[PDB]
Amino acid sequence: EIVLTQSPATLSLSPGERATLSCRASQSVSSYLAWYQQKPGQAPRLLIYDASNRATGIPARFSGSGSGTDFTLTISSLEPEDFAVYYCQQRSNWPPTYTFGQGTKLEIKRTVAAPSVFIFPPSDEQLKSGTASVVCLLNNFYPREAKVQWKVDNALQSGNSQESVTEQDSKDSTYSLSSTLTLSKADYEKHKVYACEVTHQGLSSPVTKSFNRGEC
């Protein structure tokens, strides 16, 4: 088995900067090395084939080099449309077979943005169903890293929440995050105060958004 290892796994840069991505093979693949770009929800696109050749329609700012085990992809001056996942691909064996690296994720670095924190008490319809979900929303922040802890009547939770983060927004380069705390109707009715507490690099104090059961 021939293994391609890509580095770095993740990378944040701004338009205009130069990026060079690495792909290293467990053993020589001569020049049988290709690079692909994939944007979220889109099919991959061939960029570079046979290590250094540009595919038709691919801009001159993309170039590749290398041979044997060590290959690179360089974008000389990044455009906003160049931020995406980049995969390397090698050919080997007879009959030939192809294998892909695990990918390098290149995101846009913008200025820090604190999240707007919102809390949603369970719906009237959901409470009649027998469970209660409380949703905490962190909208349009940067960087991606954020922390959410759940406190119910001043005691914090564990194992009963799920987190989800969007990909980078194509228009302001921000992220949003959802945290959902799910309880049974019986547990939910045991307590009054439900608090979402948020920490982020863009905040000076942890932010809490709260409600009291039954008062909304």
Binding site: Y36, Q42, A43, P44, R45, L46, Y49, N53, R54, A55, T56, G57, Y87, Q89, P95, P96, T97, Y98, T99, F100, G101, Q102, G103, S116, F118, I119, F120, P121, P122, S123, E125, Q126, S129, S133, V135, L137, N139, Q162, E163, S164, V165, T166, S176, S178, T180, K209, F211, E215, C216
Partner: protein
Amino acid sequence: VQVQQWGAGLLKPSETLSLTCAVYGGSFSGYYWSWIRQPPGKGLEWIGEINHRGSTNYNPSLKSRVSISVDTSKNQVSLKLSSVTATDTAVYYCAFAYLWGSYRRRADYWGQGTLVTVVSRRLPPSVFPLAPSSKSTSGGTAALGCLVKDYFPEPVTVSWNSGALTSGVHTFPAVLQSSGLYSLSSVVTVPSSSLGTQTYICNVNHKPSNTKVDKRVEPKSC
């Protein structure tokens, strides 16, 4: 030059996957078609390839289940994958490549993919409103949404106002709970001033269970 994909994508275990693609609108000399799949949230896996002469190369881990053929009369390629299981769930791409011009430059075109889901079971989502309130307002805007709870398998699609509302919509990636079921929410920012007059409805579609649900999101007052 454009590649079109066809074929059923909701299958049961042991059934046979059957996909086909065609490419439109240049001359071609020789060429190569390739099939590549991408399981949700994972990397790319090469399936195999076939040239205009019908010579095929296959991934040996699928080999014995896989067959690829061409119909050169209309630039068509087809993939069949037999005895499918859950580990075959993936987006399947067909890619068309040829060399053109005096420099024999490679041109390469991928279809947009066919989501293939292999399941023996189905459970539709329950959709609940996430009401805008004082607790989701910021300076003239308020966030509202829908919670899409405990469905199986992936995926669900969420639109807003039958697709008329698109700007600012965040439909989060589903979470797979240890219970075995998926949940996601979808949220969107609207003007507070429209909350009395403009109605907001999420349209949740779960093709695997053939269920579509519209849920109206009404405002709350604390």
